[PDB]
Structure formats: structure tokens, C-alpha cells
Amino acid sequence: AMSMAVESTGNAKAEAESRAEAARIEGEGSVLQAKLKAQALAIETEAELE
Amino acid sequence: RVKKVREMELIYARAQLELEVSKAQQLANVEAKKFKEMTEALGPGTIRDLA
Numbered sequence: 001a002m003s004m005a006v007e008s009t010g011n012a013k014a015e016a017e018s019r020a021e022a023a024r025i026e027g028e029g030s031v032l033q034a035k036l037k038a039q040a041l042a043i044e045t046e047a048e049l050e
Numbered sequence: 051r052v053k054k055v056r057e058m059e060l061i062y063a064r065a066q067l068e069l070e071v072s073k074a075q076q077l078a079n080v081e082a083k084k085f086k087e088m089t090e091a092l093g094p095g096t097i098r099d100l101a
Contacts, residue, residue, distance in 0.1 A: 045051045049058055 089097065 042051070045054070049054055 093099075
């Protein structure tokens with residue numbers, strides 16, 4: 001049951017640390033990505049007023 | 051985006067409000083002026099004896 005655990009937890013942990021790390025990239029992505037949407041959809045909006 | 055564009059269509063709305071007015075104002079004048087020329091054209095009592 002000791003091996004049962006080390007395997008079990010160690011397993012779902014490997015899969016949810018996968019989960020979270022992949023969204024941590026996606027997350028840091030979505031800031032820098034909406035930061036560029038900012039400047040883009042701002043230059044686009046700006047000469048749209050003129 | 052919004053603040054800037056809000057102000058846009060907003061300034062225009064105002065300058066095209068006084069535009070709205072001037073029209074309605076001038077026409078109201080020309081109606082009344084014509085109507086004053088009309089009224090005076092015939093007896094200010096003739097309108098009465100016609101009524």
C-alpha cells in the first residue's frame with residue numbers, strides 16, 4: 001500500500017503538474033498576447049477615429 | 051477605445067443638434083413671417099367676419 005500510494009499520488013501529480021505548467025505558459029501567454037492586442041487594437045482604433 | 055469614440059459621435063451629436071435647431075428655427079420664422087404677411091394682407095377684421 002506504500003508502493004500503491006507513491007505510484008498513485010506520484011501519478012496524478014505528474015499529470016496535474018503537467019496540467020498547471022501548460023496553463024502557466026498559456027497564462028503568461030494571454031497577458032503578453034492581450035498586451036499586443038492592446039497596441040494593435042489601439043493603433044487600429046486610433047486612425048479609425050481620424 | 052470607448053472614451054475616445056464616445057466623445058466622437060458625441061461632439062458631432064451636439065454640433066448637429068444646433069444644426070437641427072437652426073433648421074427648425076429658420077422654418078418656424080418663415081412660416082410665421084409668411085403668416086404675418088398673410089394675416090395683414092386682408093382686414094384684421096376680415097379674418098373675423100370670415101370666421
